[PDB]
Structures are given as C-alpha cells and as structure tokens.
C-alpha cells in the first residue's frame, strides 16, 4: 500500500535564519545573499532505487529564468529516512533580484518515475521579517 519511494519534505538550510524553513511533502522567505542547501528528505521502504536525480526549475513571474540537476544516487530499503542535500547556494542579492520565485522540484530516478513532483515559491526580500 505504502510506495516503495516516498519524498517525505524540502528543506532549506540556513543558519541565519530565524525560523523554520520546511515543507511536508506527505512560500519561504530568504534574505537576500544568505548561503543555503536545499534538503529533500525521501524514503525508500522496500527496494534499491538507482539513479535518484533532483530536478529543479527556477521560474520568475512565469518564466523559466533557470533549470538545475542533482544526482541523487542509488539507495536501499532502510527505516531511516533518507537526506539529500544539494550543495550550499547564496540567494541572489540586489534590489532587482529581489522578488517571488516559482520552483517546480520533481525526484526521479532510473524509470523516470514521478516519485513526485511538487511547486513551492521562494521570495527574496532585503531582511527576514
């Protein structure tokens, strides 16, 4: 009943900033110039999966302004929930990148299966709030 591979939540990890930054998966405010990692949270509950791969693409005002993609890898059943963390990115800084961001995420793997596909926004602005 329960799918073998089950994306769980998107995390965004920043030390600066002074709230949670969660998305449960079963809009974010980030201060302009802030470092950050992306942590997609998933689990794989009976079978090996191989070639997980994140998929992520940047759209401002509803154009694509940026696609990126993360190898994953291959995982095997286990309790523990999995973490993927991208490498550390640094939220864009100026008055005019500031603004709303649309993201379309989708976790594949080697299938092309659509383990999921979600959108979330992430909004830039000059301080936290």
Same mark, same amino acid.
């Given at each position: !009943? ?92 100026? !008055? ?14 080697? @299938? ?14 000059? @301080?936290?709030?």
């Amino acid at each position: !009943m329960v799918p073998n591979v089950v994306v769980t939540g998107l995390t965004l990890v920043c030390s600066s900033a002074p709230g949670p930054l969660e998305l449960d998966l079963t809009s974010f405010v980030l201060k302009e110039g802030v470092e950050y990692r992306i942590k997609i949270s998933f689990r794989v509950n009976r079978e090996i999966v191989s070639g997980m791969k994140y998929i992520q693409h940047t759209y401002r005002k509803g154009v694509k302004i940026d696609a990126t993609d993360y190898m994953v890898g291959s995982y095997g059943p286990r309790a523990e929930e999995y973490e993927f963390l991208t490498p550390v990115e640094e939220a864009p800084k100026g !008055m005019l990148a500031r603004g709303s961001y649309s993201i379309k995420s989708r976790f594949t793997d080697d @299938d092309k299966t659509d383990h999921l596909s979600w959108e979330w926004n992430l909004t830039i602005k000059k @301080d936290w709030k």
